Design an enzyme around this catalytic site. Structure first.
Site: not given
Ligand code: HEM
Ligand SMILES: CC1(C)[C@@H]2CC[C@@]1(C)C(=O)C2
Ligand SMILES: [K+]
Length: 405
Positions: A177, A242-243, A348-350
């Site tokens: 943002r 930032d999630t 998402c891995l998180g």
């Molecule tokens: C409400 C919380 C969360 C939401 C809604 C969220 C949502 C997402 C989404 C939509 C993607 C896929 C993006 C794409 O396809 O381009 C993603 C990927 C990922 N997120 Fe989450 N996220 C959240 C929390 C987290 C947290 C807490 C972590 C790490 C501490 C995290 C680590 C990752 C990573 C490492 C990926 C990349 C996976 C890959 O590209 O194979 N996220 N997340």
């Molecule tokens: C789109 C996301 C939520 C996902 C994890 C962090 C984020 C901003 C990315 O760059 C991939």
């Protein structure tokens, strides 16, 4: 401001939605995006905002595109184009097949077994923050809980000092943002500048923190490079900072405005995990996308190589073709359809960490502060971008209605 319409994009498909400042923002950010699903709006539209790009507006198309990495590549996954081109985080900027070896490594630092080992500390931090707030009868939720709870947990996982939060949080927010002070490329350069010496330090003298584990890890049995480890650690920091931080504020704004929903969770706590899933649907918050690898006809629309397509994860669950009365929060909703955590090979891995953080928050907050409301007068403002959020959430309650545990 509107980029000239390209020759190949039909004029009847133009809908000038601005993902960083949507017209209907004052109604709430999910509502503002849901204008894309009003009756006469096509399944796939072109906006001339933010340089010009496509938007899939319905779950069916969003899911299809996220499954088809051969046509819809993650090499340039952010709008505007200069952000997508600079974006090089791993694994997100890679497609299968090469993406998968790096997922496997990331999954080792944020996966279910790690979340299990963090469980006690997550619980403790939530309880300490909420106990300290409880007697005060008010808080600024975004600064007083939504930010410090998930971010302190991430900084613990990563072995980073808490006093580095303000700088890192500022940089992460410019990527999702931007306020205009930094381009994406400049914010990414600054995050990498932070990480470079820490990665080198931890390759020489490995610890047990997430950065050491990534920096010393193997991918399909060969050593990760320093540059790879940086591009993976940058992403983990963005995910940590930032999630969940934003999602908690949408959920708590809702619970502050809906006494009957809180009463449901106070009276039937067993329902909390189900409630977490239905809030993840209704208050879905992410929208990124893909770039066309070739000219491709998709759902009757000619896409051209190099076109960007925003595939908003937020929209699938809001689509009335996926969930009846999608704007209604129903904790008993039978089939909660969503792509809040994404779809396809980049799921998402998180998400296990996120759900644990959300469910602990709901349990521990409602246990101590069952009754609260938005501060009178407050006009709650949302902000839109790659990850949407809440500007401020002033809450109040009567300390007499609270409970120490
Ligand atoms: C409400 C919380 C969360 C939401 C809604 C969220 C949502 C997402 C989404 C939509 C993607 C896929 C993006 C794409 O396809 O381009 C993603 C990927 C990922 N997120 Fe989450 N996220 C959240 C929390 C987290 C947290 C807490 C972590 C790490 C501490 C995290 C680590 C990752 C990573 C490492 C990926 C990349 C996976 C890959 O590209 O194979 N996220 N997340
Ligand atoms: C789109 C996301 C939520 C996902 C994890 C962090 C984020 C901003 C990315 O760059 C991939
Ligand atoms: K790129």
């Amino acid at each position: 401001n509107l980029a000239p319409l390209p020759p190949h994009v039909p004029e009847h498909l133009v809908f000038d939605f601005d993902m960083y400042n949507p017209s209907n923002l004052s109604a709430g950010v999910q509502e503002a995006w849901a204008v894309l699903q009003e009756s006469n709006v096509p399944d796939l539209v072109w906006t001339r905002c933010n340089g010009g790009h496509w938007i899939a507006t319905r779950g069916q198309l969003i899911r299809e595109a996220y499954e088809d990495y051969r046509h819809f590549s993650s090499e340039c996954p952010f709008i505007p184009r200069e952000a997508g081109e600079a974006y090089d985080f791993i694994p997100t900027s890679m497609d299968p097949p090469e993406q998968r070896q790096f997922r496997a490594l990331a999954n080792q630092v944020v996966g279910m077994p790690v979340v299990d080992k963090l469980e006690n500390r997550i619980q403790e931090l939530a309880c300490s923050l909420i106990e300290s707030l409880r007697p005060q009868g008010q808080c600024n939720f975004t600064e007083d809980y939504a930010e410090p709870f998930p971010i302190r947990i991430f900084m613990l996982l990563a072995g980073l000092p808490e006093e580095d939060i303000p700088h890192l949080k500022y940089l992460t927010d410019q990527m999702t943002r931007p306020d205009g002070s930094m381009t994406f490329a400049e914010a990414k350069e600054a995050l990498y500048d932070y990480l470079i010496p820490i990665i080198e330090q931890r390759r020489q003298k490995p610890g047990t923190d997430a950065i050491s584990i990534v920096a010393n890890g193997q991918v399909n049995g060969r050593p990760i490079t320093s540059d790879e480890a940086k591009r993976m650690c940058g992403l983990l920091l963005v995910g940590g900072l930032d999630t969940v931080v934003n999602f908690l504020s949408f959920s708590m704004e809702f619970l502050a405005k809906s006494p009957e929903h809180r009463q449901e969770l106070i009276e039937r706590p067993e329902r909390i995990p189900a409630a977490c899933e239905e809030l993840l649907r209704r208050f879905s918050l992410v929208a990124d996308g893909r770039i066309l690898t070739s000219d491709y006809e998709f759902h009757g629309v000619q896409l051209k190589k190099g076109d960007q397509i925003l595939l908003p994860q937020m929209l699938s669950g809001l689509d009335e073709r996926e969930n009846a009365c999608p704007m209604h929060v129903d904790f008993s909703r039978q089939k909660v359809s969503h792509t809040t955590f994404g779809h396809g090979s980049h799921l998402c891995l998180g998400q296990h960490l996120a759900r644990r953080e959300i469910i602990v928050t709901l349990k521990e907050w409602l246990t101590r502060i069952p009754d609260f409301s938005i501060a009178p007068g407050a006009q709650i403002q949302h902000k839109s971008g790659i990850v949407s959020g809440v500007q401020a959430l002033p809450l109040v309650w009567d300390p007499a209605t609270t409970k120490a545990v």
